[PDB]
């Protein structure tokens, strides 16, 4: 782990990459690794990483990270401040409300239509962020990483393919 951090791409309103990359991209880069540039140098081996297509690309994942971030902390905060007991009134396995959240806020229910692999990642996030802000850990700069961390452990390794389900055995050829 090295601490890669640039202060860039909200504001980097680059375009080369199609929008289905923008689709596949963000799909992909739902809760795979901590290290993201390994992720997003070795996943995207196609896409040649031009400065302008490169911000266009990492101003997805640091659209949906700020969001996203910023999402959780607002959600685990305002358990914190107003003292809710449970986070399942919130962003945990919530049918209904955490679907109608997320999809009002991000997009029309295509983040996968979020099977519970997602609410079970909402579920252990949010539980984290709570963890962290009521114990005093989100002002220890080490926080994030065991976010990352925890929703990392379960899925590293994207292991859905979106041009067709059962079209990922046809990558396994010689």
Request: charge should be neutral; glycine fraction near 2%.
């Given at each position: 782990?090295?601490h890669h951090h640039?202060?860039?791409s909200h504001?980097?309103?680059?375009?080369?990459?199609?929008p289905?990359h923008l689709?596949k991209?963000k799909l992909m880069?739902?809760?795979t690794?901590?290290?993201?540039?390994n992720?997003l140098?070795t996943?995207?081996?196609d896409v040649?990483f031009?400065?302008?297509?490169?911000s266009q690309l990492?101003?997805?994942?640091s659209?949906?990270?700020?969001?996203?971030?910023?999402?959780?902390?607002?959600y685990?905060?305002?358990?914190?401040?107003?003292?809710?007991?449970?986070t399942?009134?919130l962003?945990?396995?919530?049918?209904?409300?955490?679907?109608r959240?997320?999809?009002?806020?991000?997009?029309?229910?295509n983040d996968?239509?979020?099977?519970?692999?997602?609410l079970?990642?909402?579920?252990i996030?949010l539980?984290?962020?709570?963890?962290?802000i009521?114990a005093?850990?989100?002002?220890?700069?080490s926080?994030k990483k065991?976010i990352?961390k925890?929703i990392?452990?379960?899925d590293?390794?994207?292991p859905e393919?979106?041009?067709?389900?059962?079209?990922?055995?046809?990558?396994?050829?010689?």
């Amino acid at each position: 782990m090295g601490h890669h951090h640039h202060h860039h791409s909200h504001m980097a309103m680059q375009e080369g990459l199609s929008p289905n990359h923008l689709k596949k991209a963000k799909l992909m880069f739902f809760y795979t690794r901590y290290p993201s540039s390994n992720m997003l140098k070795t996943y995207f081996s196609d896409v040649k990483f031009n400065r302008c297509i490169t911000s266009q690309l990492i101003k997805w994942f640091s659209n949906f990270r700020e969001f996203y971030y910023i999402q959780m902390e607002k959600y685990a905060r305002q358990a914190i401040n107003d003292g809710v007991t449970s986070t399942e009134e919130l962003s945990i396995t919530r049918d209904c409300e955490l679907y109608r959240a997320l999809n009002m806020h991000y997009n029309k229910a295509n983040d996968f239509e979020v099977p519970e692999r997602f609410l079970e990642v909402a579920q252990i996030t949010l539980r984290e962020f709570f963890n962290a802000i009521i114990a005093g850990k989100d002002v220890d700069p080490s926080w994030k990483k065991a976010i990352y961390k925890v929703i990392c452990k379960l899925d590293s390794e994207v292991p859905e393919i979106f041009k067709s389900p059962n079209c990922l055995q046809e990558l396994l050829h010689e």
